[PDB]
């Protein structure tokens, strides 16, 4: 039944990512609970918004809930006669039907790989989280000849289904490594900022491959009239038409990601604000450091492998650097902050008619938290300082560092540089939120320039592997600094 | 004074039981404040039942508590009419004052080993607890000269002390490692579950060494009738009938044990679930586990050594064994718990007489527990999977694996074959819940048959090692996986 | 500009303290937050117990904060009404006034050795905090024929930076080492009792160097008259007339300093009883333990990377000595008080009308503060025993340790002997509170005995090296029991 699939890309793609959501079911409830989260978020703050009236739950017998909900019918109409909140309903309905539309594709689409995994492999469903994926493509290329899915080529090889996984993947990282995107600027107060976001990623994927008109023609060739060097000048046009209708559509729809962008990140991230106040101050591989560490012919999970390795280093290196004016700051914080706690905690001890004060309660909870904010930029009074020991033991894990950062790795150089590949939590979730807003911006004024060099890289860079297609060349280029398998 | 004590076994027991628990003093104050939390378990419990009233109390001027609590007299005479309670009561009252007759008794034996240690060891009580088991061992052999306590063999030695104390753990071992004693057995829903708590093993050693018509005559020395083969049916059938009268008394005293289980857990474990709500998902050494990984005379702070030299590892090891959907189902609810918990807060702080109202303050109290317990069976987004090189630096401290565990270290067949040897707290705590209603059950049904093998394993396991007694043989058997010193 | 400052001491003493508070601005705006704690502090405390009146936020429409305030005319009046509040004002004044008026010349004072890094030196004052001490000092050296400071002698030398730096802390390191101050004591209860405060540092440091008429004539040339052996008495007499006035001074100022001690710890150290009860069971390395592992020629930094390498071997091995009383109370305290927690919490969360009852919250509180300090006396069920491969790793960070220490680490003589070089973060603020009382008390009858070998000290262990002046002899004595570079 899978002879000549035709589309192997795509299959491969799910084959793989069927073993990475590990099991059928699980996937099924991952995308299930996915749908709730949207729903849920939607409803509730349509809820919150019309519902619940704050008059008499704000106190001007015990007041109960079910006394501030109001009663459907006039909720309801109430939500009728808003109208800028039933357009913003109408838009979320039909992108979640669109969504489900989706889902109940790929359902049918994710059992035929089900039932490959099952039958042409003799992997049981229970056996796939303790399994890996060599095991799966050594079985996938040790039974290419039963299951019959790729015979016109001579065989089927490891090489093969990678360049068949990560055709695309290659090209971003090439061009994201060839400097031929707009992600870097110059902002007067902070100098240097990399900013790549995945609203940015999703938005150059689908300008240059995804969709009918892009570079690619099917999925594995892309069109002829790219080969050439006699178009030059009309391809670069039609790409800069392109790149400008797709940065005014994202313009178009940027109240809405805006605020779905605010309601999520208030939604997911607010509880932290209690719960772990601290865990804001971590760190995480930012999006352009994943980009920049990575090989060509590299799985996700084998990316991830070495980011996770390579993690406890670059925390205890970004941690070896101290800020003298912070760390005065947070001090002297925390110092005010708890004097005042203190003798607000001594006075509800010695008598607790003080808490029904007007703001003593919230005065003491915004107090706790800020003391135990800034109680988190003190660093540990005892902590050993041996930065030249910790990039050896990083570079070993992430293979790839500039030239100018083994001879010199206490230098207030290598800190900024390095803070660009690990970035701050709060400032990952901030430029998020600005992504709705300057993401059109870089897709007119800052790619639309461009859009001639890259039509130049994509005929000069583009290697005819036979049995699979065109792909990114890997030797042609091999300037980024270290190298390492 | 310490001439032909005549009571070897115990008298070794407890000179190494005053070394363990550190100080004469120590342990005198341990038991005292043993009696004291059983004696406050009982009163508090009763206290809560009879005399505090709960209707001024949950207000159905300012209310105070001794307004609740009902005059003594009244009290008493609400405890008196009782009956259901007044009956637990006498018979708690005198299990507490058979347990204070048996702490008295004990005073006095305990502190004729501290004669025994201040004068024939000069070892001062204020030395104990920065001395070793090795040391005090090598006094007492080497003093045996001058105290005289056994002359009758030619002399003492570090097997024979070894011998004295382990004689009954020696044979527990040899038992629970030939599977001659029913722990296993086959669940619909779970499939093997190995069962094994303190009262089953309390009850195993109840009915074969101790009391006075056990297999042992005095106590180094099992009657001879059980040294020959012509009454093995007799034997047997004297065993069925002693084991089914056990097993009948444990089910009579099957509802004091059951509520006094429930009131201590209760007392014990629920200020967890707000100090530290993920303790409960850590593991420890199953009683099974104990008597599975440990060696032929070896005491119980030299197997405690090892078993804590790897814990580390065997955590790590059970931590890199992700249950895909518990943690789907962990991040989806704590995402819906918080995000409900920050739109209550929220309100709460910008205004907080919303928490007058009636159940905002324990649905919040209760999303804050639910979102921190489900937080943690989230694993760290960053951590290293090495299942292969973690047995090598277990089994290099347990000593013992099944020869099937070195080869395949990642299937989900090792996992689940190690986490009975390395169980959840709430498992062990489930199954001490369940241990007084399915004790007698394993004492009827599953020990009684096995009845007839057991005596043939004391008939043909028993070595008479001159000047100790009877004790179990140790290269007899050797079928333990691995093996090691 | 500078040429000839005729001051090298306190121009090195500046030119470093500049580098290790990192950069002007940095030491500016620290110095500028001291003074503002220091009036807050006295402001606030003088508002609480004035203003406020307690009687009406106590409780005997809602209540808010500015109904309490009373108006600032009557405050005021009621503040100069006092007297014996208002003496303490004028006190504290004065005392601001003074650390003010030595704030404004240092700024200048310190603006010149700005100047002297940045001209001199090519140092911006943005690279000074990713520079070393070692190449600042190479660069002073380098470039000391430009700047021109110091042609009087041949050359420069990093050890006459050493030596200019360092002189008077070499001087007490040898006395401390030599046993010639009086800070051991015999306590019944304790016994064996090591005080040494900062109040005590500063009082000799205030005796012996700096001053008047001190032992050192300008500031590095101790006067003649102490360098010849005929007028012993003669000095010995008014070295004990001199301690005596200052230990009467410290007695009259007894008051003082004990309030200011006792509000500066209880604003800066209550806050920590809720966010991090266990925090004051840590360990520090004490002042007398400074002093002790404490090279000659040694910078404060160049200490303190030896004290935090050497600092989490130090915490494991004095978590190695278990305290068996200790460990049975805080065990038993627990179970009870969250036995108690726990059913208030169940009634709690059953009803929550219960809230309102006099004494329930404090309650609650107090008995979670109690069970979360005496959880932090159980040590961890699983943790490794290796008391003798701990001294090996902690020797070779703080290079000295008698020579009875070695052969016998699990000893209750050795855990006693270290305690006094690692001691309690309590007992550090315990002996810190009792120092305004207990500094004069040893200030009169303990050091004015010994003034006489003092004076013999200073004598004979005084070396006149060329280009420097007078500083202490290291060779002579050698009698500190390690050694190590």
Not at 162 to 173: A, D, E, P, W
Not at 278 to 299: I, K, M, P, T, V
Not at 457 to 476: L, Y
């Amino acid at each position: 039944p899978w002879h000549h699939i035709e589309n192997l890309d795509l299959f491969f793609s799910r084959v793989y990512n069927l073993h990475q959501k590990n099991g059928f079911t699980c996937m099924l409830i991952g995308e299930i609970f996915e749908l709730m989260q949207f729903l849920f978020v939607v409803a509730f703050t349509t809820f919150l918004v019309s519902c619940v009236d704050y008059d008499i739950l704000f106190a001007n017998v015990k007041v109960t809930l079910p006394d501030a909900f109001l009663p459907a019918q006039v909720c309801s109409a109430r939500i009728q006669e808003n109208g800028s909140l039933i357009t913003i309903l109408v838009i979320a309905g039909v992108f979640w039907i669109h969504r489900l539309i989706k889902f109940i594709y790929n359902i049918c689409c994710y059992w035929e790989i089900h039932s490959f995994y099952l039958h042409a492999l003799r992997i049981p469903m229970s056996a796939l989280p303790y399994c890996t994926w060599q095991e799966v493509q050594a079985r996938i290329v040790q039974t290419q000849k039963e299951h019959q899915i790729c015979i016109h080529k001579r065989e089927l090889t490891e090489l093969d289904i990678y360049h068949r996984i990560l055709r695309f993947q290659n090209y971003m990282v090439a061009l994201v490594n060839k400097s031929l995107l707009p992600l870097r600027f110059r902002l007067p107060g902070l100098g240097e900022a990399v900013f790549f976001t995945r609203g940015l990623k999703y938005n150059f994927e689908l300008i240059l491959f995804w969709g009918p008109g892009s570079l690619f023609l099917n999925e594995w060739s892309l069109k002829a009239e790219y080969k050439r060097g006699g178009q030059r000048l009309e391809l670069a046009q039609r790409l800069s038409n392109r790149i400008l209708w797709i940065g005014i559509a994202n313009f178009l729809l940027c109240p809405l990601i805006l605020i779905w962008q605010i309601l999520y990140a208030f939604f997911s991230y607010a509880e932290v604000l209690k719960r772990e106040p601290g865990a804001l101050g971590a760190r995480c591989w930012s999006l352009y450091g994943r980009c920049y560490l990575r090989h060509f012919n590299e799985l996700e999970h084998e990316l991830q492998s070495r980011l996770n390795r390579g993690y406890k280093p670059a925390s205890k290196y970004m941690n070896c650097f101290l800020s003298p004016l912070l760390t005065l700051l947070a001090k002297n914080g925390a110092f005010f902050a708890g004097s005042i706690l203190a003798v607000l905690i001594a006075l509800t001890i010695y008598d607790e008619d003080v808490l029904a004060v007007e703001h003593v309660l919230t005065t003491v909870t915004l107090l706790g938290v800020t003391v135990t904010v800034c109680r988190s930029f003190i660093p540990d009074q005892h902590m050993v300082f041996c930065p030249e020991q910790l990039l050896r033991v990083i570079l070993a894990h992430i293979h790839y560092m500039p030239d100018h950062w083994q001879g010199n790795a206490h230098r207030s150089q290598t800190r900024d540089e390095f803070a660009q590949l690990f970035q701050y939590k709060a400032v990952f979730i901030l430029e998020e939120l600005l992504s709705p807003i300057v993401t059109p911006l870089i897709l007119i004024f800052c790619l639309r320039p461009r859009a001639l060099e890259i039509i130049d890289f994509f005929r000069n860079f583009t290697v005819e592997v036979v049995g699979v297609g065109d792909t990114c060349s890997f030797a042609q280029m091999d300037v980024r600094q270290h190298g390492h398998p």
